[PDB]
Amino acid sequence: KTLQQIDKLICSWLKQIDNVIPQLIMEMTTETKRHRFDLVTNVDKQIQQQFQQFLATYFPEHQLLAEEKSNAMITNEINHLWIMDPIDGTANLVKQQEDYCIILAYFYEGKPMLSYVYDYPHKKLYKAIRGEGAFCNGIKMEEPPSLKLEDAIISFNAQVMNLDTVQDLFDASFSYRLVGACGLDSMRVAKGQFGAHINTNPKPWDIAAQFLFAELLNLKMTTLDGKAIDHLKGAPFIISNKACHETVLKILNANGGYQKYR
Amino acid sequence: TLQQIDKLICSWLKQIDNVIPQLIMEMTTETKRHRFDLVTNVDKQIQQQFQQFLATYFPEHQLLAEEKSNAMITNEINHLWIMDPIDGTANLVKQQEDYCIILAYFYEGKPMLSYVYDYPHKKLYKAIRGEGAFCNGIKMEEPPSLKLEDAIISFNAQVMNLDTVQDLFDASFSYRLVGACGLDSMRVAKGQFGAHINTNPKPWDIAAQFLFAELLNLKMTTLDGKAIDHLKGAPFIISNKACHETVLKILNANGGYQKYR
Ligand SMILES: [Mg+2]
Ligand SMILES: [Mg+2]
Ligand SMILES: [Mg+2]
Ligand SMILES: [Mg+2]
């Protein structure tokens, strides 16, 4: 199989989920996990099951690393690895029915080859294909214009950060917005609408697709130390326009750094 | 009937839909009071064109609007339209997304028609005294009750004290921000958010919301619980009914929400 061929299969499968999701929204059940605000719905689980049955049924060699199942499951060493957040932004799904997505990323011998962020509520499928480029619904994306921090909007979670560094990021930037799903706030950076998105504790599925978007669109995607991220393991991370990446990291690691307690 | 006036407004909106591309094509950006206070040709032309519409079809009606001078009398005026030609100009210029047109009509002080048009996503929220509130025709209903602890909230955390920001985070389900008063308010009308706060809105930022709040059974007041005068700003909130008091309580507590540094 060629990559365009695999993409044809995956797009096709993502598109056919437009048919299923409404039914699941209509019969939505909710459980908690690590605490009462750590939600998981019937929608998350059904989308994951169906992808795994789809993977089993076309790429039986390939593995799945995904949020709503256990994963061991090794480096890398796994020739063909899929990583999935069946619903990124479950809270938003639950509370708003909007601003959530589906994340998939394909890795061959550890190198990222295909990435998808599907903004279902707005029927906007973002994908990235190595050798072809990045697209939103077939409309090819290009590297965004340079944005300095003071000219850019930033997105991050202000509840899990020391309020001093929160303030500094407000002061240093043009404005603050939050969509509330890593894949969506990440896409706003890829489109050039936000200068940078931060998440101080993502799981691997929250950021798996963004790797290839960052590469093909000359974005910086690093740890909050400016280091490479290991796609199997999470790390605190940033996805940024090139002209403001250094400035945001400088601000975050300043004065003892960015955690509550420093 | 306002049904009639509504058809005409809707038809003006359709016409503006065909116009905005051209305006973007030749977009031009200036700043007003500071580097963060933007205006573009899109703002100016949309406004000028409603002014023309109104001079054509309703010559006794008056217009209070962001991009022009306004005097223009408090009380004592029978047909008044309030306009924010683009609400979320920062979003337009920075994101080309999440901005709206805000338009509302007031007959002897009373809300009769209101319009929040989310052009980017082709969604028109309207409200019509006697008929109801609509989103592209689908009738909007009063949203379910939302206690604060089960609700997402939206506000500008930069303009506020960081102790009351925290206390607001502590008491709600989560925090989001769209960045246009029109759209953050419509999230509340839809029950996606429990409340939205703006501490220093202009009349045009909040003018459409009065009529939505009334018909959908929301609360809309100052940050002291009072009636808002539609002709002048005031620090304001629009809230699901089941979280209004709690939010106001938290905002006024420990000496208030205002910056101290
Ligand atoms: Mg989760
Ligand atoms: Mg998830
Ligand atoms: Mg303005
Ligand atoms: Mg405006």
Smallest Cβ–Cβ distance between B179 and the set A97, A98, A175 belongs to A175
CB B218 within 8 A of CB B189: yes
Q: Residue A240 has what DSSP assignment?
A: E
The token pair that represents A198 in the structure block: 């931060």
Superfamily for the B1-141 domain: Fructose-1,6-Bisphosphatase, subunit A, domain 1 (3.30.540.10)
Instruction: Spell out which residues of chain A touch residue B88, defining contact as CB-CB under 8 Å.
Output: none
Contact B157 A176 (CB under 8 A): yes
CA atoms of B3 and B8, how far apart (whole Å): 9
Q: H or E segment at A239?
A: strand A237-240
Q: Which ligand is nearest to the CA of A37?
A: 1
Per CATH, A1-142 and A143-262 having the same topology is answered: no
Residues from A contacting B (CB-CB < 8 Å) are 37, 91-92, 95-99, 122, 152-153, 158-159, 163, 166-167, 170, 174-180, 188, 193-194
Superfamily for the A1-142 domain: Fructose-1,6-Bisphosphatase, subunit A, domain 1 (3.30.540.10)
Instruction: Spell out which residues of chain A touch residue B174, defining contact as CB-CB under 8 Å.
Output: 37, 91, 95, 159, 180
Smallest Cβ–Cβ distance between B169 and the set A92, A159, A194 belongs to A159
Contact A188 B95 (CB under 8 A): yes
Q: Which residues surround ligand 4, an ion (CB under 5 A)?
A: B 66, 84, 87
Instruction: Spell out which residues of chain A touch residue B95, defining contact as CB-CB under 8 Å.
Output: 153, 188, 193-194
CB A17 within 8 A of CB A50: yes
Domain boundaries, chain B: 1-141, 142-261
What lies within 8 Å, CB to CB, of A13 at 6+ separation is: A51, A54
Tokens 């940024």 locate to A240
Q: What is the resolution of this structure in A?
A: 2.5
Smallest Cβ–Cβ distance between B177 and the set A122, A163, A177 belongs to A177
- Tell me the three-class secondary structure of chain A, residue by residue: CCHHHHHHHHHHHHHHHHHCHHHHHHCCCEEECCCCCCEEEHHHHHHHHHHHHHHHHHCCCCEEEECCCCCCCCCCCCCEEEEEEEEECHHHHHHHCCCCEEEEEEEECCEEEEEEEEECCCCEEEEEECCCEEEECCEECCCCCCCCHHHCEEECCCCCCCHHHHHHHHHHCCEECECCCHHHHHHHHHHCCCCEEEECCCCHHHHCCHHHHHHHCCCEEEECCCCCCCCCCCCCEEEECCCCHHHHHHHHHHHHCCCCCC
CATH 3.20.20.70 fits B142-261, yes or no: no
Cis status, amide bond into B142, omega within 30 of 0: no
Contact A193 B95 (CB under 8 A): yes
CA atoms of B62 and A166, how far apart (whole Å): 44
Smallest Cβ–Cβ distance between B192 and the set A96, A122, A174 belongs to A96
Contact A163 B158 (CB under 8 A): no
Could you tell me which residues are beta bridge partners of residue B236?
B198, B222
CA atoms of A205 and A201, how far apart (whole Å): 12
Instruction: Spell out which residues of chain B touch residue A97, defining contact as CB-CB under 8 Å.
Output: 192
Contact A175 B95 (CB under 8 A): no
Instruction: Spell out which residues of chain B touch residue A170, defining contact as CB-CB under 8 Å.
Output: 157-158
Of the candidates A156, A94, A161, A102, the one whose C-alpha atom is nearest the C-alpha of residue A126 is: A102
CATH topology of domain A143-262: D-Maltodextrin-Binding Protein; domain 2 (3.40.190)
Contact B158 A179 (CB under 8 A): no
